[PDB]
Amino acid sequence: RNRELTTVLVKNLPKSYNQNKVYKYFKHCGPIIHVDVADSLKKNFRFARIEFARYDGALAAITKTHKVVGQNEIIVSHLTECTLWMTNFPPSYTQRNIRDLLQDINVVALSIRLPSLRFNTSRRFAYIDVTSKEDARYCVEKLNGLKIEGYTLVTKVSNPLEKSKRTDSATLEGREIMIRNLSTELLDENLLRESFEGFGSIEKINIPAGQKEHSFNNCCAFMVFENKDSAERALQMNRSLLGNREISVSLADKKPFLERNEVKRLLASRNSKELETLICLFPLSDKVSPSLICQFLQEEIHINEKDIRKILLVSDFNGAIIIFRDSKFAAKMLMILNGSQFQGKVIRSGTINDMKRYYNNQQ
RNA sequence: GGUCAAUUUGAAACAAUACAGAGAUGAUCAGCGGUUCCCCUGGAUGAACCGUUUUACAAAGAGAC
């Protein structure tokens, strides 16, 4: 997709102009996907961002430049060089928090867009459209490197082609193997290097701590190769003997896969001791993180942080699982939370099956 | 009992939390088959549910034939 290509910026709309009036003014130009309106800094006029379905619609809108709306002469232009990409804001930061950051440095924000957590609960970044290239460069100047709650903010002029390499990229790229069922005697970086370096250059070896120290029967290690072909061929070591131990070798799985399989175990659980310690909250937006939910439980419901064991998203049923420390606390939370308000919307509480039944009814 | 097998355990998931939009994903939430409900006059939908393809090793094993 290319949002920018079909998006235009409108400057100097009348104070009285709302999203609806913007639609009516421009809807003859072509079908519109989205409209945002924002006040100017001093509230004397309004800006609009209009995302058209197709490029021809954006072209048609631009023919309205220097036309008069009310008694305001508007300017319509391609939205370009006005988009920031931001990451590593705190886990509980909201769209409003980001908007307020820019407000503080006197930058008008037209649109702030956050990603779905559906397939990865940890996703955390945002796109922000401002009204000028100057404001965009100013946001980078003031906000890139800003420390917020211990997090060093990243703020960039948006260009996905320039994206940084993630620190976990080796796993994403299929270059990391996991070796399982090593004995403590074999849990030795030198031995692992000697046994695997024939396949290709080894970039890194990671051995989880505490394994020898706790005398584990089976130990694991991870090995990153400089290229994917070496890691693939190293899989031939699966089921091979190292000393007198048959080892397993596989491509390391990634976190979102592992995390989802954990949730699946819960959804399939029939252990009543376990089930009675949890509740589900639904329906919830798929943009809502466990951290945001935790903050809500602590600040609005006055639950203590340590009464909460874990929060897991179940976005396939528009919900989240909250695991508490006992069934009695869970039961009281069931009562308190049902019908409470979260993000301006009423939410329900219930069992896993209640959550599923509610979802099925909406479909 | 003899094969089949919810799950539990051996057992440690490292690597920096983030790190490029539903523009994301691996059955991670997939494909196919099959009964049900919805709406027509055997059919057309959508959804749910049930099986088959898929799955590192090892020990144990609710419950099934």
UniProtKB/Swiss-Prot annotation:
The keyword Protein transport does not apply. The keyword Hydrolase does not apply. GO terms for molecular function: RNA binding; snRNA binding; U6 snRNA binding. GO terms for cellular component: nucleus; ribonucleoprotein complex; spliceosomal complex; U6 snRNP. Residues 6-81, 82-160, 175-254 form the RRM domain. Keywords: mRNA processing, mRNA splicing, Nucleus, Phosphoprotein, Repeat, RNA-binding. Its main location: nucleus. Monomer. Interacts with U6 snRNA SNR6 and the LSM2-8 complex (small nuclear RNA); to chaperone formation of the U4/U6-U5 tri-snRNP (small nuclear ribonucleoprotein) assembly, the protein is displaced from the U4/U6 snRNP once pairing is complete. Present with 672 molecules/cell in log phase SD medium. This is U4/U6 snRNA-associated-splicing factor PRP24. It comes from Saccharomyces cerevisiae (strain ATCC 204508 / S288c) (Baker's yeast). The chain holds residues 36 to 398 of 444 of the full protein.
